[PDB]
């Protein structure tokens, strides 16, 4: 009775969604921008080299003023650097060594740490008594934390490996919205430059798009052969890019619901540990397992500049707010700055 | 600093002193001995941690014979294992705890697939993975008393329809031990220990101590030729 009608309605809706997805993809990006002149070679080179880490680097994040950095490693350290003079600004000890993500508030006041202990800890910088102390320990998840980002000084987004996502308020400590609907473990989420939307990828060859105040999931995204490790977000808010573990990076649209572009080369048979964009959106920056980062033309996917210089796997990379530099953090303990 | 402002000198001083502290901390954080613990549920991991006196990951620490031992118990997690184990490739040893008594009990709808099938599948998955082709494996065998008191009244072929031996304890114990130690695919690099637990076995961690000593000598006696 009710069950049969529900199954029939679900099948009909799935067929309609598949038909819409098939019809929407009239042409690909590579077929439209054949008249755009190539960027040529980009012989980027090292300007600084930060030292002092001992085990691998898991996460790095920029600041809003394009000058300071933060990075987290196995040893138990979260370190805030001054890029111009290659100096320490802050050093932060931890209690859980198995960190996987970093956050740095757009007001220069708070940072965040998270990983393999289910708790997202939030740290206050601009103190009075002279030490970056601990304020809040957000709990409520049952699996390892993948990534966390700040909305403002009193709103945060977290995701773990339980198929769930959380919108949280620092002041009270109580979760405000739970997002469910994933099958596999969730690996990452990116924000939007209006704090109203966000997108996540899960270890089930899918990525979904969610509204931030309603609590619902408005879109679902398929097309990969294995799990997605890293995802980031296009600055204008009408596309995003994901990185799988089957040697292919993808560019989707948050408004067309279809696989749009793919990046992969035959000589590359390894994974994509991190993907980032740049300020103008004309470069895609990818960290691989072949020990070197590639720089794809993020709009034609027909070429790649190359950045080498690491003795191990690349795990994270970032780009300044103003576009001045790009930073790579890898498994050899060294963090490097290109301009 | 003739070309430095009056205030960047203190900045350089701060950065240098933080580098000193990092270096000292990361030098003192390479002298404690790592260990990674594993075992199927209800297989005696609680007994192992209780006898030797030591959610997400649960870490635990103890001090013996002037060495600080650090055991990572990771059984509280139920997520996929492809993701949180490659951060464990620097450990000396993998402790693997199982029990000999559960040779009959069925954990699912398939009566042939008892608990030992799952334990040996986990063992084979761990031994033949990429991030542990140089890692010693310590196999703790538990529950001997109930095993004898069961096989006095029940056969063994219920889970081994190829066994042709005596139905006393010793032959069963030898057969189980060889059945565990014969799945290794490269005996030129790895090694597989075994020790039989008992409720008064105050030597429960002495076995681990000896295994780690031998692993370290194997490393130091290979990196210098010989």
């Amino acid at each position: 009775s009710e069950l049969d009608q529900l199954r029939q309605e679900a099948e009909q809706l799935k067929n309609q969604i598949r038909d819409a997805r098939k019809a929407c993809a009239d042409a690909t990006l590579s077929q439209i921008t054949n008249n755009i002149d190539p960027v040529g070679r980009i012989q980027m080179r090292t300007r600084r080299t930060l030292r002092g880490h001992l085990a691998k680097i898991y996460a790095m994040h920029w600041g809003t003023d394009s000058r300071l950095l933060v990075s987290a490693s196995q040893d138990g350290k979260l370190i805030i650097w001054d890029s111009y003079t290659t100096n320490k600004v802050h050093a932060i000890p931890l209690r859980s060594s198995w960190v996987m993500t970093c956050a740095y508030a757009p007001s220069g006041n708070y940072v965040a740490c998270g990983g393999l202990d289910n708790i997202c800890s939030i740290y206050n910088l601009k103190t009075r008594e002279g030490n970056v102390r601990v304020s809040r320990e957000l709990a409520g998840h049952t699996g390892y934390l993948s990534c966390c980002r700040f909305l403002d000084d009193n709103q945060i987004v977290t995701s773990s490996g339980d198929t769930t996502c959380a919108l949280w308020d620092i002041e009270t400590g109580q979760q405000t919205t739970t997002f469910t609907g994933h099958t596999g473990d969730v690996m990452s989420l990116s924000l939007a430059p209006d704090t109203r939307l966000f997108v996540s990828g899960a270890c089930d060859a899918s990525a979904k798009l969610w509204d931030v105040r309603e609590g619902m999931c408005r879109q679902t995204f398929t097309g990969h052969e294995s799990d997605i490790n890293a995802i980031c977000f296009f600055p204008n808010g009408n596309a995003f890019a994901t990185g799988s573990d089957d040697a292919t990076c993808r560019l989707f649209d948050l408004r067309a619901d279809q696989e749009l572009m793919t990046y992969s080369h035959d000589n590359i048979i390894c994974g994509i540990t991190s993907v980032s964009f740049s300020k103008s959106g004309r470069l895609l920056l990818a960290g691989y397992d072949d020990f070197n980062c590639n720089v794809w033309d993020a709009l034609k996917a027909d070429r790649a500049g190359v950045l080498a210089g690491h003795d191990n796997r690349v795990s994270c990379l970032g780009v300044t707010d103003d576009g001045m530099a790009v930073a790579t953090g890898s498994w050899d303990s060294f963090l490097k700055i290109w301009n | 600093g003739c070309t430095l402002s009056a205030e960047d000198k203190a900045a350089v001083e701060r950065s240098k002193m933080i580098d000193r502290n990092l270096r000292e901390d990361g030098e003192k954080a390479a002298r404690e001995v790592k260990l990674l613990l594993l075992g199927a549920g209800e297989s005696g991991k609680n007994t192992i941690v209780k006898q030797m006196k030591i959610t997400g990951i649960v870490e635990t620490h103890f001090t013996f014979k002037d060495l600080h031992f650090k055991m990572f118990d990771v059984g509280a997690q139920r997520s996929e294992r492809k993701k949180w184990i490659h951060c464990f490739e620097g450990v000396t040893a993998i402790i693997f705890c199982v029990a000999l008594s559960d040779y009959d009990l069925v954990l699912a709808e398939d009566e042939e697939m008892n608990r030992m099938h799952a334990s040996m599948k986990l063992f084979d998955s761990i031994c033949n993975n990429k991030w542990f082709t140089d890692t010693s494996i310590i196999l703790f065998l538990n529950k001997k008393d109930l095993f004898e008191e069961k096989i006095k009244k029940s056969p063994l072929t219920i889970c081994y329809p190829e066994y042709a031996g005596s139905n006393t304890y010793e032959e069963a114990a030898a057969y189980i031990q060889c059945q565990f130690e014969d799945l290794n695919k490269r005996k030129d690099t790895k090694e597989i220990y075994t020790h039989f637990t008992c409720s008064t076995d105050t030597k429960n961690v002495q076995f681990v101590f000896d295994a780690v000593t031998d692993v370290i000598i194997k490393n130091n006696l290979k990196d210098c030729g010989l």
Partner: single-chain antibody, 230 residues
């Protein structure tokens, strides 16, 4: 955050005495420390500076061989030691903290000071007294004998206030920024050797003495300070 100073008094020329500063409420060992002094009837003048790790020490010109600064970290304490005094050395002393890293705001918090009695680039302050009224806008200005704009964009000028019976309190660091606990009516700006501070909508407990200071290169030099009286 509390900085309590002790050890002052009245001594005859010569002799020796040690002025101590006890800190409570903050991480002692991440801040560098300064000692400053004020004349019984006139302005301020830098004295000494000690830094983190006991690495660097700077004195002024009229002080060497006589003064010794040190810090004792475990008890969170700072020491100045003084010997062979003269009648020119009667003043009152303040212990100031400052932490140098990018974005910081040095000279943030000042102590109460202690009275001691005994039986180059210079700052020119435009005026000695200017009358005021509660409700009009006011400006003050001073000038420096050499340019203070370094090569990195910094413009090292510090603006301080002192109300009657009180201790100094920061108002402006690096020519454009507000310290902690100060209303947003205060403002300031500058140019090539001519520096201005602006107060709008005057009030009570806003009358007293104003000072300007440089920190481009040691030794540090004050000026004579102007007065708004009402």
């Amino acid at each position: 955050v509390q900085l309590v100073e002790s050890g002052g008094g009245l001594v005859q020329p010569g002799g020796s005495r040690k002025l101590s500063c006890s800190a409570s409420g903050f991480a002692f060992s991440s801040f560098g420390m300064h000692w400053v002094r004020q004349a019984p009837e006139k302005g301020l003048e830098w004295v000494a500076y000690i830094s983190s790790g006991s690495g660097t020490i700077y004195y002024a010109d009229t002080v060497k061989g006589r003064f010794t600064i040190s810090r004792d970290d475990p008890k969170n304490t700072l020491f100045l030691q003084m010997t062979s005094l003269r009648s020119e050395d009667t003043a009152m002393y303040y212990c100031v903290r400052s932490i140098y890293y990018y974005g910081s705001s040095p000279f943030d918090f000042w102590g109460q000071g202690t009275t001691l009695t005994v039986s180059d680039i210079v700052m020119t302050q435009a005026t000695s007294s200017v009358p005021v009224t509660p409700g009009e806008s006011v400006s003050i200005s001073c000038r420096s004998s050499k340019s203070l704009l370094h090569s990195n964009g910094n413009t090292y000028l510090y603006w301080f206030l002192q109300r009657p019976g009180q201790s100094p309190q920061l108002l402006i660091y690096r020519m454009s920024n507000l310290a902690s606990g100060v209303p947003d009516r205060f403002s300031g700006s500058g140019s090539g050797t001519a520096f201005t501070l602006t107060i709008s909508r005057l009030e009570a407990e806003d009358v007293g003495v104003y000072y300007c200071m440089q920190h481009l290169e040691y030794p540090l030099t004050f000026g004579a300070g102007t007065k708004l009286e009402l």
